[PDB]
Design an enzyme around this catalytic site. Structure first.
Site, PDB file in Angstrom:
ATOM      1  CG  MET A   1      -2.103  -1.126   1.194  1.00 50.93           C
ATOM      2  SD  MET A   1      -3.033  -0.688  -0.311  1.00 50.93           S
ATOM      3  CE  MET A   1      -4.256  -2.064  -0.082  1.00 50.93           C
TER       4      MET A   1
ATOM      5  CG  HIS B   1      -2.723  -1.090   5.073  1.00 48.06           C
ATOM      6  ND1 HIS B   1      -3.852  -0.819   4.279  1.00 48.06           N
ATOM      7  CD2 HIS B   1      -2.257   0.216   4.960  1.00 48.06           C
ATOM      8  CE1 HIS B   1      -3.959   0.113   3.593  1.00 48.06           C
ATOM      9  NE2 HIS B   1      -2.834   0.993   4.122  1.00 48.06           N
TER      10      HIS B   1
ATOM     11  CE1 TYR C   1       0.063   2.819  14.585  1.00 49.09           C
ATOM     12  CE2 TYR C   1      -0.409   3.967  16.594  1.00 49.09           C
ATOM     13  CZ  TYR C   1      -0.697   3.020  15.798  1.00 49.09           C
ATOM     14  OH  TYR C   1      -1.494   2.354  16.001  1.00 49.09           O
TER      15      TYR C   1
ATOM     16  CB  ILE D   1      -4.584  -5.132  20.459  1.00 44.22           C
ATOM     17  CG1 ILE D   1      -5.570  -4.040  20.472  1.00 44.22           C
ATOM     18  CG2 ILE D   1      -5.452  -6.563  20.064  1.00 44.22           C
ATOM     19  CD1 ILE D   1      -6.717  -4.286  21.588  1.00 44.22           C
TER      20      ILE D   1
ATOM     21  CD  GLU E   1       1.650 -11.855  13.933  1.00 39.68           C
ATOM     22  OE1 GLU E   1       2.437 -12.247  12.935  1.00 39.68           O
ATOM     23  OE2 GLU E   1       0.820 -10.996  14.056  1.00 39.68           O
TER      24      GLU E   1
HETATM   25  N1  LIG Z   1      -1.928  -4.331  18.462  1.00 34.59           N
HETATM   26  C1  LIG Z   1      -2.022  -3.234  19.022  1.00 34.59           C
HETATM   27  O1  LIG Z   1      -1.474  -2.922  20.500  1.00 34.59           O
HETATM   28  C2  LIG Z   1      -2.945  -1.818  18.308  1.00 34.59           C
HETATM   29  C3  LIG Z   1      -3.154  -0.968  19.247  1.00 34.59           C
HETATM   30  C4  LIG Z   1      -3.869   0.159  18.691  1.00 34.59           C
HETATM   31  C5  LIG Z   1      -3.991   0.205  17.430  1.00 34.59           C
HETATM   32  N2  LIG Z   1      -3.714  -0.854  16.503  1.00 34.59           N
HETATM   33  C6  LIG Z   1      -4.200  -0.777  15.078  1.00 34.59           C
HETATM   34  O2  LIG Z   1      -4.407  -2.140  14.572  1.00 34.59           O
HETATM   35  C7  LIG Z   1      -3.972  -2.326  13.087  1.00 34.59           C
HETATM   36  C8  LIG Z   1      -3.574  -3.641  12.987  1.00 34.59           C
HETATM   37  O3  LIG Z   1      -2.584  -3.596  13.792  1.00 34.59           O
HETATM   38  P1  LIG Z   1      -1.724  -5.096  14.211  1.00 34.59           P
HETATM   39  O4  LIG Z   1      -1.516  -5.143  15.636  1.00 34.59           O
HETATM   40  O5  LIG Z   1      -2.717  -6.367  13.651  1.00 34.59           O
HETATM   41  O6  LIG Z   1      -0.540  -5.025  13.475  1.00 34.59           O
HETATM   42  P2  LIG Z   1       0.243  -5.970  12.562  1.00 34.59           P
HETATM   43  O7  LIG Z   1       0.114  -7.410  12.905  1.00 34.59           O
HETATM   44  O8  LIG Z   1       1.679  -5.725  12.328  1.00 34.59           O
HETATM   45  O9  LIG Z   1      -0.524  -5.728  10.991  1.00 34.59           O
HETATM   46  C9  LIG Z   1       0.169  -5.799  10.015  1.00 34.59           C
HETATM   47  C10 LIG Z   1      -0.523  -5.987   8.712  1.00 34.59           C
HETATM   48  O10 LIG Z   1      -0.171  -4.732   7.701  1.00 34.59           O
HETATM   49  C11 LIG Z   1       0.429  -5.354   6.504  1.00 34.59           C
HETATM   50  N3  LIG Z   1       1.426  -4.529   6.069  1.00 34.59           N
HETATM   51  C12 LIG Z   1       2.230  -3.730   6.776  1.00 34.59           C
HETATM   52  N4  LIG Z   1       3.204  -2.961   5.578  1.00 34.59           N
HETATM   53  C13 LIG Z   1       2.210  -2.855   4.731  1.00 34.59           C
HETATM   54  C14 LIG Z   1       2.488  -2.043   3.525  1.00 34.59           C
HETATM   55  N5  LIG Z   1       3.347  -1.301   2.954  1.00 34.59           N
HETATM   56  N6  LIG Z   1       1.513  -2.237   2.284  1.00 34.59           N
HETATM   57  C15 LIG Z   1       0.632  -3.148   2.724  1.00 34.59           C
HETATM   58  N7  LIG Z   1       0.392  -3.840   3.914  1.00 34.59           N
HETATM   59  C16 LIG Z   1       1.266  -3.833   4.931  1.00 34.59           C
HETATM   60  C17 LIG Z   1       1.182  -6.675   7.176  1.00 34.59           C
HETATM   61  O11 LIG Z   1       1.264  -7.478   5.967  1.00 34.59           O
HETATM   62  P3  LIG Z   1       2.545  -7.393   5.296  1.00 34.59           P
HETATM   63  O12 LIG Z   1       3.938  -7.096   6.295  1.00 34.59           O
HETATM   64  O13 LIG Z   1       2.853  -8.918   4.984  1.00 34.59           O
HETATM   65  O14 LIG Z   1       2.566  -6.557   4.076  1.00 34.59           O
HETATM   66  C18 LIG Z   1       0.343  -7.227   7.943  1.00 34.59           C
HETATM   67  O15 LIG Z   1      -0.912  -7.566   7.243  1.00 34.59           O
HETATM   68  C19 LIG Z   1      -3.214  -1.151  13.005  1.00 34.59           C
HETATM   69  O16 LIG Z   1      -4.156  -0.070  12.339  1.00 34.59           O
HETATM   70  C20 LIG Z   1      -2.863  -0.597  14.397  1.00 34.59           C
HETATM   71  O17 LIG Z   1      -2.491   0.824  14.322  1.00 34.59           O
HETATM   72  C21 LIG Z   1      -3.146  -1.890  17.134  1.00 34.59           C
HETATM   73  C1  LIG Z   2       2.056  -0.388  16.132  1.00 38.49           C
HETATM   74  C2  LIG Z   2       2.198  -0.701  17.614  1.00 38.49           C
HETATM   75  O1  LIG Z   2       1.854  -1.884  17.991  1.00 38.49           O
HETATM   76  C3  LIG Z   2       1.355   0.123  18.504  1.00 38.49           C
HETATM   77  C4  LIG Z   2       0.704  -0.834  19.566  1.00 38.49           C
HETATM   78  C5  LIG Z   2      -0.270   0.008  20.408  1.00 38.49           C
HETATM   79  C6  LIG Z   2      -0.361   1.222  20.249  1.00 38.49           C
HETATM   80  S1  LIG Z   2      -1.525   2.061  21.355  1.00 38.49           S
HETATM   81  O2  LIG Z   2      -1.754   3.595  20.826  1.00 38.49           O
HETATM   82  O3  LIG Z   2      -2.610   1.512  21.269  1.00 38.49           O
HETATM   83  C7  LIG Z   2      -0.884   2.174  22.791  1.00 38.49           C
HETATM   84  C8  LIG Z   2      -1.657   1.798  23.771  1.00 38.49           C
HETATM   85  C9  LIG Z   2      -1.181   1.492  25.009  1.00 38.49           C
HETATM   86  C10 LIG Z   2       0.218   1.910  25.304  1.00 38.49           C
HETATM   87  C11 LIG Z   2       0.569   2.004  26.647  1.00 38.49           C
HETATM   88  N1  LIG Z   2       0.902   1.826  27.937  1.00 38.49           N
HETATM   89  C12 LIG Z   2       0.854   2.471  24.382  1.00 38.49           C
HETATM   90  C13 LIG Z   2       0.569   2.889  23.027  1.00 38.49           C
HETATM   91  C14 LIG Z   2       1.457   3.314  22.110  1.00 38.49           C
HETATM   92  C15 LIG Z   2       2.501   2.403  21.639  1.00 38.49           C
HETATM   93  F1  LIG Z   2       3.353   1.980  22.560  1.00 38.49           F
HETATM   94  C16 LIG Z   2       0.308   1.967  19.175  1.00 38.49           C
HETATM   95  C17 LIG Z   2       1.137   1.333  18.283  1.00 38.49           C
HETATM   96  C18 LIG Z   2       3.681  -0.481  17.740  1.00 38.49           C
HETATM   97  F2  LIG Z   2       3.734  -1.123  19.163  1.00 38.49           F
HETATM   98  F3  LIG Z   2       3.928   0.709  17.781  1.00 38.49           F
HETATM   99  F4  LIG Z   2       4.495  -0.987  16.959  1.00 38.49           F
END
Ligand SMILES: NC(=O)c1ccc[n+]([C@@H]2O[C@H](COP(=O)([O-])OP(=O)(O)OC[C@H]3O[C@@H](n4cnc5c(N)ncnc54)[C@H](OP(=O)(O)O)[C@@H]3O)[C@@H](O)[C@H]2O)c1
Ligand SMILES: C[C@](O)(c1ccc(S(=O)(=O)c2ccc(C#N)cc2CCF)cc1)C(F)(F)F
Ligand SMILES: NC(=O)c1ccc[n+]([C@@H]2O[C@H](COP(=O)([O-])OP(=O)(O)OC[C@H]3O[C@@H](n4cnc5c(N)ncnc54)[C@H](OP(=O)(O)O)[C@@H]3O)[C@@H](O)[C@H]2O)c1
Ligand SMILES: C[C@](O)(c1ccc(S(=O)(=O)c2ccc(C#N)cc2CCF)cc1)C(F)(F)F
Lengths: 267, 261
Positions: free
Chosen positions: A73, A100, A163, A198, A201
């Site tokens: 993307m 993504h 970010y 959340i 990995e």
């Molecule tokens: N997990 C958390 O603590 C948390 C907290 C707040 C918000 N979020 C949000 O949740 C969403 C997904 O996060 P996640 O935790 O599931 O992370 P993730 O596991 O790292 O998701 C990565 C996904 O995006 C794809 N991707 C990475 N670079 C890309 C590129 N250049 N073009 C197209 N695809 C790409 C990766 O696939 P490929 O690398 O294989 O292309 C993979 O499918 C994000 O919007 C994140 O901000 C997560």
């Molecule tokens: C993409 C990523 O996975 C990510 C996860 C979580 C959030 S967050 O905004 O939801 C969040 C939540 C709780 C706390 C706390 N303490 C901190 C944050 C900032 C991140 F450390 C932001 C980003 C990372 F870790 F940066 F790679």
């Protein structure tokens, strides 16, 4: 303009859904839940191996159909081509989950303007591009955009500036687009998902000796997003805590917008 | 507990319903709605002459029964016994609308302990007696309690301090038993009704020389009280500049209690 029913898996049966960043983390989980639910599903990310796997489980799990199209993307041509190609594959589009994000790490900001631009391109500009491309189909199905955001997209944070900017930008862009839709009599719903930590990995890889919070199950997270979008809500809050899940709502904003809602009533 | 349902006048009829301070303003109106929707209505106040006016208009509007009792709510013996009498006269009770108050005007509180005491008696204490007497019957019908309050029961205003005190009292009390019920399995419903300025005689005489925005109508208000009352909502707002209606809400507090519970 929230729905006035209660969620049921059947709201999704026969629905045609795109999920992006759908190869690992939440994205995977969403595909699976949409699979259990009997939806047509198109998933995407860069690596085609991992995507194949996801497509398998999805078909075994119950999807009316399930494809994948691999690509970055980073490149806007693909973004607009992916959408046209995926609405072909399923013959139309009901919901678009924009999930993504570009690889990020927790680190202090000292001059990475490559990362800042890249975040902006992938995490924000692509969303708009995809949305532009999906909008025609979405209109004609009365579908739904879902957008996945974060604490860092509502409040500030030291390790993740590039970010945050990108996440903040979604709020501003889609919320301000949501207004336009109301007045436009555009009947496509816009749901913003604000999530705390959340268990992915990736998230753990990037936080597991710095951040102390308890992280929520990826599986449930994914279902709350599908539902929020199915129920056409405006925001979905999800965090292990409930202290947090109640603060990120900002009624000052609810007010001011309501107020400034009538500083104009012109086309 | 909420209800995402919608209000039709039919949620009422057959329902057994008390309406205090019915001899004037908003009380009259609430009853006249309950009459135009036809439920069982026992109505209190002191003035016996006017509590006749009201009792008959309600029949000629379609009430499945209209009766009055006439006393001063200063009398905690009377109050407890009014709810017995009305309990008998109806064979049960579904909705109790506590509304009465006591003669106030805007006045800078100098040293009038008397007015402060009466206000706590009539505006707070009595409603508490009314409730306790009512509680067996309302348990038996999974009923609702409606408490009518005011801006001055959420935020400070000068000049109505005895008032505010009695209003604030109602909040602490009823919101606090509310919780007692829920975490208890008791299916009784408590509505607090927060009302800005309303257009009533005794309420217009009082605010005379105060630059208010137009008081919203007693009617839709009365209706609103009854609606959310019936809708079993925890709290009900209503003000003319519906602006206010927004920020009168206090989200800050909701958070706190959620956690302590
Ligand atoms: N997990 C958390 O603590 C948390 C907290 C707040 C918000 N979020 C949000 O949740 C969403 C997904 O996060 P996640 O935790 O599931 O992370 P993730 O596991 O790292 O998701 C990565 C996904 O995006 C794809 N991707 C990475 N670079 C890309 C590129 N250049 N073009 C197209 N695809 C790409 C990766 O696939 P490929 O690398 O294989 O292309 C993979 O499918 C994000 O919007 C994140 O901000 C997560
Ligand atoms: C993409 C990523 O996975 C990510 C996860 C979580 C959030 S967050 O905004 O939801 C969040 C939540 C709780 C706390 C706390 N303490 C901190 C944050 C900032 C991140 F450390 C932001 C980003 C990372 F870790 F940066 F790679
Ligand atoms: N009006 C407003 O601007 C407005 C705004 C905010 C809140 N409210 C609230 O609305 C509710 C009703 O207000 P209102 O404007 O309808 O008042 P109102 O016009 O003065 O009516 C008062 C009622 O109370 C009765 N009453 C007075 N003294 C009593 C006593 N000692 N014992 C029993 N009943 C007594 C009166 O009947 P008798 O004289 O026959 O006894 C009358 O029926 C109150 O809780 C008030 O706080 C009103
Ligand atoms: C019982 C009475 O009718 C009364 C009406 C209104 C309220 S109020 O708290 O809700 C209120 C509402 C609007 C504004 C404004 N502008 C000001 C106030 C305070 C009053 F000065 C309090 C009391 C009165 F006036 F005392 F007789």
């Amino acid at each position: 303009q929230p729905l006035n029913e209660e969620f049921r898996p059947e709201m999704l049966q026969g629905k045609k859904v795109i999920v992006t960043g759908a190869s690992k983390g939440i994205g995977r989980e969403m595909a699976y839940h949409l699979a259990k639910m009997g939806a047509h599903v198109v998933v995407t990310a860069r690596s085609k191996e991992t995507l194949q796997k996801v497509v398998s489980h999805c078909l075994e799990l119950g999807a009316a159909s399930a494809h994948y199209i691999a690509g970055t993307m980073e490149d806007m041509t693909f973004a607009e081509q992916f959408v046209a190609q995926a609405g072909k594959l399923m013959g139309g589009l009901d919901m678009l989950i924009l999930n993504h994000i570009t690889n990020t790490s927790l680190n202090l900001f000292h001059d990475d303007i490559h990362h800042v631009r890249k975040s902006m391109e992938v995490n924000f500009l692509s969303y708009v591009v995809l949305t532009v491309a999906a909008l025609p189909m979405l209109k004609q199905s009365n579908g739904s955009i879902v957008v996945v955001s974060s604490l860092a997209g509502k409040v500030a944070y030291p390790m993740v500036a590039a970010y945050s900017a990108s996440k903040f930008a979604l709020d501003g862009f889609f919320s301000s687009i949501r207004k336009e839709y109301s007045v436009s009599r555009v009947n496509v719903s816009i749901t913003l998902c604000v999530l705390g930590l959340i268990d992915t990995e990736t998230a753990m890889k990037a936080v597991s000796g710095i951040v102390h919070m308890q992280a929520a199950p990826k599986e449930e997270c994914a279902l709350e997003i599908i539902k929020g979008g199915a129920l056409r809500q405006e925001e979905v809050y999800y965090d292990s805590s409930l202290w947090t899940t109640l603060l990120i709502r900002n009624p000052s904003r609810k007010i001011l917008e309501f107020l400034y809602s009538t500083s104009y009533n012109m086309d």
